[PDB]
Design a protein around this nucleic acid. Structure first.
Ligand SMILES: Nc1ncnc2c1ncn2[C@@H]1O[C@H](COP(=O)(O)OP(=O)(O)OP(O)(O)=S)[C@@H](O)[C@H]1O
Ligand SMILES: [Mg+2]
Length: 163
DNA sequence: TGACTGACTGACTGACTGACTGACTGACTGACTGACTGACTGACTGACTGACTGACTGAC
């Protein structure tokens, strides 16, 4: 079809979703839509996870392109706040800034959302203790035994990456 | 039935780390660097040596 929807991928239900490359397949907007559908039909909070703090413009770069595809429901963009049908459930999450994470109470999020996972020829100033950072986040949110999933996508097929 | 608001707020900067790149270099080393005891034996030598001269008798 045109834009594959990842439900068949989600069928296996392992938490780690290693999707690689796929420039322009619509995994970006599928992983935008999916938590919105989950919050609408069940009531699960969602958090758009990036790596750094300085990006604030992603108030509108995440949510506009997927706002219209929903036919008959209401959406509100309030900066770091995301509202679906007048219910506040979405916020941006920086990884470089970890400390604000350790103060913030965890919203109940079924699946963490993340594409552009790989760094291609960056300045190499990524997050130190990177795999340890992801482990610390996973322990931090849902310290109970309730299961939590994660979706992570890389721009290009880098066969080996730190995780 | 309302009119600034005082404390949350987008944001939009204002100062600062390291990572990576752009030449030194002085550190390090290797390929000369011309000497310097050894070989040794090419040339040199006294040390050591075996057969011709030297004739009054064996013989007369
Ligand atoms: N719900 C949707 N409604 C409309 N178009 C969609 C939807 N989901 C995906 N797409 C399409 O998906 C295409 C690819 O856009 P992205 O979602 O950014 O792809 P992407 O797969 O994240 O690329 P990568 O892998 O991150 S480099 C766009 O042209 C959209 O039209
Ligand atoms: Mg993407």
């Amino acid at each position: 079809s045109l834009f594959y929807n990842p439900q068949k991928m989600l069928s296996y239900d392992r938490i780690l979703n290693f999707v690689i490359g796929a420039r322009g397949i619509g995994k970006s907007y599928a992983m935008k839509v999916y938590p919105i559908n989950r919050f609408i039909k069940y009531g699960e909070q969602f958090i758009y996870v990036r790596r750094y703090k300085p990006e604030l413009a992603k108030v509108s770069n995440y949510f506009n392109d997927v706002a219209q595809e929903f036919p008959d429901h209401e959406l509100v963009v309030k900066g770091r706040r995301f509202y679906i049908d007048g219910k506040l459930a979405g916020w941006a999450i920086p990884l470089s800034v970890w400390q604000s994470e350790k103060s913030n109470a965890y919203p109940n999020v079924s699946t963490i959302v993340f594409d552009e996972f790989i760094r291609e020829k960056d300045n190499s100033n990524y997050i130190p203790n990177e795999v340890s950072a992801l482990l610390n986040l996973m322990d931090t949110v849902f310290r109970n035994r309730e299961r939590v999933r994660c979706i992570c996508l890389s721009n290009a097929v880098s066969v080996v990456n730190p995780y």
